[PDB]
Amino acid sequence: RDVLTVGAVGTFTVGWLLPRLEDFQARHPFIDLRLSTHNNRVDIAAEGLDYAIRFGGGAWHGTEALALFEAPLTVLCCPEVAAQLHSPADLLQHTLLRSYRADEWPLWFQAAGLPAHAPLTRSIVFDTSLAMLEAARQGVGVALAPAAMFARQLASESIRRPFATEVSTGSYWLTRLQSRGETSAMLAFRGWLLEMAAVEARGRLE
Amino acid sequence: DVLTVGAVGTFTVGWLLPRLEDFQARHPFIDLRLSTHNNRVDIAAEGLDYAIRFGGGAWHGTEALALFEAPLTVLCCPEVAAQLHSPADLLQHTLLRSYRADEWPLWFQAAGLPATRSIVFDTSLAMLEAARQGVGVALAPAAMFARQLASESIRRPFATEVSTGSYWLTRLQSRGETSAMLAFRGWLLEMAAVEARGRLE
Description:
The structure is a homodimer.
Chain A lengths: L2 E7 H18 L4 E7 L5 H4 L3 E6 L6 E8 L2 E4 L2 H5 L12 E4 L4 H8 L11 E4 L2 H9 L5 E4 L4 H5 L15 E7 L6 H22 L1
PDB class: transcription
Keywords: Muropeptide Binding, Effector Domain of the Transcriptional Regulator, transcription
Assembly: dimeric
C-alpha cells in the first residue's frame, strides 16, 4: 500500500539513481519502493518488476521503453596508465577492457579518427561497467564506459579521462512489459524519474 | 590455443585478476578469454570451458572443484561504523541484501541475535559501492574487498562472520578437459591453496 518494484542496471543504480532516490522518498512517502539491481539482461516477468531501467537502443520485444538520456562512451583508466597515453594510437599497447557489446571499441576508434579495430586479445569482457572500472582502477587495462556514471570517481580524481573523444551507442531507458497496466505508484515514479532525467540531459549541453 | 573462463565478477576483480599476470607468465602461449557474469550462468549456452561460481558445489551436470570458502561479514562506510556499537544497532540502517535467499538471518543467528525495507543487489560489487556512498550496511565476503578495507574507505565493524558457500571451478561433465584447461586448473588450485592457508595463518 502501495508497492512499487523497480529493477535497474547496477551501474545506473550506484552511479546515478541512488544519489537522487532520497528526493523521491521525500516527495512520495507513501510509496514502498523495492529496488533491485541487474546486469542488463533483466527479465521483467521472472523478477517480478513493475519497471526495469536498462541500457541500449530502446527496442526490446514486448516492451514499452521511455528514453531517459544518452550515455556516450569514453576511455577511462587509472592515472598510472593515463600518463603513458599521448595519442589514442597508444591504446593498442594496453589491455582493452570491453563489454559484451562487441562493436563499442571499433565505433570509438572511428570517432577518434582511427581504423575500426577490432579488439580480440588482448582483452577481457565484462558483464557490468562497475566490474570494468574496478579492473581499470587496479591497472589491469583501459576501460570504455559512460563517463556520466562514474562522475564521483572522476571528480575525486580516482580515475582519469585521457581523451576528449566520445561515441554515442545507447541510452538509458525506463521499460515496462506491454502486457501490464501502469499502476498509480508506477505513474508517480515515472513522473519523478523523467523530471530528474531531464535535468541530466539538460546538464550535458550545459 | 584458446581457453574461455567465465568468472563471477566480484571474484574476478577482487581476487583473480591481480594474480593472472603470474599465470600468463608461466604459460605465455595460452590465449585466455576471460569473461564475467553475475553467478547465474548456463555453461553450455555461454560456450565456456570453465565457469567460476559462488555456492554449494552441487550444480547438475557439472564437475565442481572447490577453491576456498567465502564467509560473509558486515561492511559499511566510516561514519555508519562509528554509529555501530553492537549488532542490534544494525536495524537502524537499511540492510543491503544480495539476491540470495537469504544471508542476513544466518548472520544474525551467528552473532547471537534472534529473528528495514531495502535493496537487493545482483553483484556484491554494486552492493559495496552503495555501502561506500552511505546508502546502507552491506553483508559480503570481506576477502573480495581487501583493497577497500586496506585504505579504510570500507570498515568491518564486527568480528562475526557466517559461511554460506564457497567459490568453485565448474565444468560440464560433457566436454573434454583441454590441455590449456588442465594447466589453468593446476595453476588456479595452487593459487587457491595459498589463499585458504592464509586464512588459518
